[PDB]
Each structure stands twice: as C-alpha cells, then as structure tokens.
Symmetry: C2
Subunit: 478 residues, 2 copies
Amino acid sequence: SLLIRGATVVTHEESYRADVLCANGLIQAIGENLETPSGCDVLDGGGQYLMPGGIDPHTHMQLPFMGTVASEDFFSGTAAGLAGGTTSIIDFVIPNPRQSLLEAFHTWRGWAQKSAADYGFHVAITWWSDEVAREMGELVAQHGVNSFKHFMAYKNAIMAADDTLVASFERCLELGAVPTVHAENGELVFHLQQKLLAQGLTGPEAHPLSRPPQVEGEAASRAIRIAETLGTPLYLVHISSREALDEIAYARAKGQPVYGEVLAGHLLLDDSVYRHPDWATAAGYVMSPPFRPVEHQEALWRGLQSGNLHTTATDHCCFCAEQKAMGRDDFSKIPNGTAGIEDRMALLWDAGVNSGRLSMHEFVALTSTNTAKIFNLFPRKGAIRVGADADLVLWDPQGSRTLSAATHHQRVDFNIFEGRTVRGIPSHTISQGKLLWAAGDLRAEPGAGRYVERPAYPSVYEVLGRRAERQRPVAVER
Amino acid sequence: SLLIRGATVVTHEESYRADVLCANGLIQAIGENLETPSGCDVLDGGGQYLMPGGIDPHTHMQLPFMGTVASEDFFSGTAAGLAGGTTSIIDFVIPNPRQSLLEAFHTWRGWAQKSAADYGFHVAITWWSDEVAREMGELVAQHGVNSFKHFMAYKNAIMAADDTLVASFERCLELGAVPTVHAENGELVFHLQQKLLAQGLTGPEAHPLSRPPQVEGEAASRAIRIAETLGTPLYLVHISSREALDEIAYARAKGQPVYGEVLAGHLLLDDSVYRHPDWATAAGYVMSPPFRPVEHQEALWRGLQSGNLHTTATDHCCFCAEQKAMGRDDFSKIPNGTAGIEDRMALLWDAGVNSGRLSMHEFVALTSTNTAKIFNLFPRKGAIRVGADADLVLWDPQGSRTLSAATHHQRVDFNIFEGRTVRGIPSHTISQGKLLWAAGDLRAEPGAGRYVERPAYPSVYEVLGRRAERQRPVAVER
Ligand SMILES: [Zn+2]
Ligand SMILES: [Zn+2]
Ligand SMILES: [Zn+2]
Ligand SMILES: [Zn+2]
C-alpha cells in the first residue's frame, strides 16, 4: 500500500488538506492523520497538491503510416505520460477501409498489451456496411468500447461522408455510444492541397493554407447538426479555431450536448511555426488541424473559461525527422502528428493556473474529470474518493522544468515547445496505487497497465430519451 | 410616351417630389413641372409614391414536374406580377441530369417568349462534367447569364455534392458569375423523409418534420464556407430559419460577400399551417424550405432591418389541388411550391412599412434595388434616373386589397394568405414605359417582355481580386 501524507487534495470543485491511503489499486481511506497499515510506503506530500491523474483521451501510439509507424509505441508512450502526470489514455483502433473492425481491434489490443498504465480504445468508423454496424454492437457489448471516431477529412482514404455519418450516429444512438469526430471538410482540404501543389507551394508553410480555419468550422457545424437531427451527443476532437468553437457554443446555447477537446499546442502556438527557414523544424509542427493565427488561441482560452471547451488531450502521434522528411518535396506527404502526452498537464498548469486564467479546480476538470464524465468513467477515474482507481499526481507548484527533445521521455526527436520553461510540475505520479514517477525517476514497466472498459449509456442518454419521448410526432386526424 | 405627374418619387435612399417622363422604354426626364411632349399620356400621381417596379429574382413559371407542369405559365405569371407591382423576374433553367445546359436554355427561352414583362434566367448546375463547365462559359459569354443555381437537397436527383459545389463555384469565379444555392442538407432530408414514412406519418404535417431548421442552417454554413474558401460571392435563396440567417450574419461580420433572399411567406406564416384538418389546405402550404415555428419569422424581420437579409422574392411555383393531391398518400410526392408573385410587394409594404419595421427606402431596396445590384442590373433596373428602364409602380398608401384565390390573377386555386387584407397597394404598374396595370385593369400582352441579359463580373469581384492578391501564398525561402 501507499499513503500520501501532508498534501492538499485538489479536486474539480474543492481543496482540502487530507491524507490519502491506496491499496489493491484503489483509494482506501481519505482523512486527516490516517493510520498507517503495516509495511506501507509513505510519500511526503507537504507543500504540494494531490490531484487525480491526468486522462488523455486522444493518443495514437505506434499508429501505422505508409510502411512506417509512429516512433512512440504503447509502452514508451504510456511511460512518458506517467512522467508528465497522465495516468491513463484512450487511443484509437483505426480499421483500414473494408477491414473488419473486430480484426483491427484485436490487433491493437495485441499492440497495447505492453502499456505501462491503464488504457482504452475508441474505434474509428472508416467505412460502412451492415457488417460494420453489427461489429460496433459487439465492440460495445463485449469489448468495453463506448465511443466511435469519425474522420471528415482524408478524402479517398478514411473519410466518412454524410451518409456514413448518418448511419453511424444512428447506430451510436441505438448502442448508447458517444460519436466523436475529427472535424475538417475533406473535399476542401483535398482541393486546396492540389491547388497549392500546382502553384509550387510544396513546403510545410503550405500545410496550414491547405486547411484554413473555416474548413474546421464547416465540418463542426455539419457534425453538430447531424447529431442534433439524429438525437445523439457529440464529442469534437482537437478544436483549434474560433469558427469551430463558435459552432459548439451555438449548439450548447440551443440545449444540445456537444463537447469540445483542445490540445496545449493549439492554446499556445500560432501558425508562424510553419514559416521557419529550417525545413525539418517547420515540418515538426505539421499536424491536422494545424496551428492557427493568434486570435484563435485567445478564443480557445475563452472557451475553456466559459465552459464551451471541456477536455484537454494531446493527439500524441510521434514521427521523427526521417519520417517527417517523407514529405520533403510534398507537404501533403509529411506524416501528420506532434508529441504531447508528457507535457500536457505542466503546459496547462503553467499557462492556465499561474496566469489566473483557470482555477486549480478547472485544471483538474480539464485534465481528468470532464473526460471521465463524458466517456462514462466517472467516478472510477478523475475522482479522489474511497473506492476510486488509485490514479493520482502529486504536484509541486514551485518546481520547474524545461521542455526539450534532448531530455523528454517521449520517443521522438522533436518537441513543439522546445526550450519552454514551466513552473509547476508533477513531482510524483501514482497509477493503480503504485509509485511509477518519482523525483526524476520513471519506474514504468511493460505490461503493467490494464485494458479499461467503458460502459455504454452515459447520463446524457437519459435526458435525450425524455426529449425524444416529448418530440414524438403525431398525425393529424382528417 | 408617359408622364407621371405630381407623385412623390421614392428610391432606395431618398424621397422627393418630381414628375417623371418615360419614352422609348426609358426614363427620359425627372423634375418638377416637366413639359408635356405632344401626344404624351399623363398619369395623375397626386397623393401617391412612385418607385422602381419590383424585381422578383426567384420564379418557376410552368416548371415541369412528373407528368405535369406548374399551373402558372410565363405569360400568366408575369401578368400577375404586373398587377402586383412587380415588373421583372429572374426564373431558372433546370436541366435534367446529363442534359446539355444549352439545350435546356433554348427550351426555356421558347417557354418564356410569352412573358408580358422583362425576364431573365439563372441556370441550375444539376450535374457536372467538363462539358457542363464549357457550357457555363458559353452561357455567360453569349446568352447573358451571370448566375448559377445549386441545389444542396434532392438526393438521388439533382443534388450538388461538395465536389460539384467546389468545381462549379471555381468555374463561377473564373467567369465572374454569382453562385446561388438552395441550402438544405439533402442527406438529412432524405433520411428523415424515409424514417417518417416508415412510421406511417404520410400527411402534410410530416413535411416540416422531414426538414427542420438546422438542416437549412447546416447547408448554409457549408455553402458559405465553400464560397469563403474559393473566394466567390454567394447568394442564398429563400432563407427561412434563424440558424441559416445567423450563418449569413457570421460570415458578413468577417467581411464576406454573402447575400440572403427571403419570401413573404417565411416572414409571416408559421408551421401550424401544416396541421390544418383539411388535407388540401395543409398541402397548399407545402414548399421547401417549409414554414417555420414563429421564432423564425421574428429573426428574419430583424435580418431585414439589420442588413443581413438583402432581397425579397416569391419562389413562385404554382400547383393546383389536383396536382398537390399527387401526394395524398405520401407527403414526399406532393409537388412543392406556393404562389406569391402578385402579392409580394403589398404584403411587405403592409407588414413592414405600415408597422414602422421598414422605411420606405428599405422597402425599395428590398423589392428591386438590392437584387439589381447583386446581379449586375443596377442602374438599368431598380433605379429612378434618366436613362434607366421605365419599370415603375405607383403606390397608393391608403388603398386596400383582400388577397383571395377567388380574385387574384395568379393561375392557381390556392393563396397562402387567403383572406388577408393589406393597406397600401400598387394602383398602376409601368413596364418598358407602358401602363400595363391601372386601377384594376390588367393590360398585359403575351410576348411584350424582353429577355434581360446580365453582364458578368459585378463590382464585388473587383474587391475580391485585390483581396486575393493581398492574401497570396508566399513560399518560404530556405
Ligand atoms: Zn484528428
Ligand atoms: Zn488524432
Ligand atoms: Zn428552391
Ligand atoms: Zn426555387
């Protein structure tokens, strides 16, 4: 067992001094001056904040691309998360077109066995048939999946057009599953890529021009209004633009359950990174959606503060210099992705809490509790309460860290915040009740993490079901 | 020649006392106590307002449907328009899928030859190919077309998907033509129609349910953001919902050239009309987009007052009871459309000007001048100035009329404003300088109207071109 003594417990709504006892993977006792069971390790939390461990609902460990694969695998990635205070992830099973969803799922489960910390899967709907629909039923009922991902970009690859979006959202409703969407208009992205390439604009500086913010705003509007029409909730991954944020606020202002996820990169970086004179440096920032002009950063902070953005994630998707250079003559061939799992909570604490933009309670809500609630993992995760999973982070408000590809634990040779010094760091990270990160020493072990099942029918479907009862149409008697 | 003496001239910006002399189709002189040329007819305008004749940019005279055609033809519709103060129309050439646009154009010119007042055509892009693109250029260069219509609804028929919208809008930009769009999400409409019919809801009350307002809002957002991305203007026909209007205002707030058209029906009727216990009465209201819950009418009036809705039209598309009854067992087979060309200006004067919602100058802008400017017909039309076309209406602010299918001149057995009494009516209508409507006497003659060519490149393209140069992508030198 493990007892954290002397800390201030900080949740998504309150702070209070208390000790916390963990055993058998769970929180067993909370209170002042708890007794110590015999042979129990004791961590001295004086002067620090004890918080739920971060949940990163957006990762892509060892995701295949071309004949190559993300340079971070499920062990190195989950270990790097632990070093940064993140104690569990939700990754993505991405079937090839016409490939069995269950086949892809078992493959990814094999890849994920080596994880060092708890993990789960979204499953992407990259094509449609009666069989896909039946397979999502089996994934929900027998494999712990409760959320399905849709890509509106990637024409002539995994794009979900309207008819797939409609059939699949309808299926999610039947199953009590949460539809999630990468919102970018695939036709416009494809058209702009071709236009820019024909102009000889082949460098990384053309990447953001190929998918400007209104391309994301349009896709968000469309996914949102499909969800409204079919009567499902909707989770929009990595919101980067004022345009898309505004569509979310509009829908939430109509009563509709729409959630938005944001990455630290899109809160803190602007699109000038793509004009760096060194090709490799500019290519290190290539991801979709791309980093944006500054006015969007301000708008996103506003969403977080006003409750129209709800979770943070990383889109952790690592490619080293030689992989990025596959697009040296064609930016559309640059493997898209940036690293962030190790860095998310310190970036957010330092930019959000130290500034006074966010309270520490909002910080917890935005790094674990909201994600737990949305995907039906609360209070098993994101909660400091007796019986909850013992996933915790001890936080030193006066510690500092300089982010650097030379020192980080992420298996990648680039950091989009290279040289940034933050104040406020995870001094200790506890997963399943075990101390896996301590004072610069990572103790992660391959195979330690568990596959985490998520039950269907989160609370929102009760509300939605009563709405549909009252909107049931009624014929006119004539 | 025709001299209108003693009236108050009312334009889109000012009012003043003056006589107006017409000859050889044109306004020849404006001023007080104008000399009377010998043989000149004189019209006493004392106590009345003289404004530009209405322009209705959205009519469907004798539109073919299944085995039948709209019950109004090009003569009877333009004659009814004249009785209502409207002196010219823009109709639609609608080629069948895979049919030559030029072939359809010539057929429609043959049909419209019988018009009693000036007329022109938008051309609908109902399918796509290189030849479609070639023909658009020939239509602009040789046949006086400068606007192309796109239907986002009507799946499995004439829907333009994103790839056609992109390709066609790009062609519009190369040609200096205005893209126009019927904005409803056709996949959602199709889905809801099938789901309602499978629940046995076959009556007209199911029609509004099959295309709720967010379906128009989504499509508007998508067309707006394609136009933004391709750098074209955009004209949205018959806006009916707060959602779509909000998308227009959002784009206009960012400086984008987006125009919205509205029908009197959507300003003054609500969706309760579809629950009328008489089937034929409810079916008389069935058009797309449908009439809306009452919050939407208020929003549209504010759109008119704020400059975010720009033109009025009727979507004049007449079907008699026996034709409407084609969908007695299946609302989706009711021919869609209502009549309004005769009624538009009185309805808007009586509801807008009498109430203080609209100035008299806004009334002129909304019934002629804005349409003329948008489609590059100003100041030929929509203007009271020497050398402009002598298309005029003399308006009696104290005259009254009761709208009725029993007394209107539209060749249709239904009026969606049956029994409504309006104050402020056109006492006289002048077209090409001839008195064609005078105190209840309709003098319209088949073939009197002229085909009206609209030159390409309205002024908005000049500013768009400077914008595009200023926003040029610039390669990074490395
Ligand atoms: Zn994505
Ligand atoms: Zn992703
Ligand atoms: Zn229409
Ligand atoms: Zn129409």
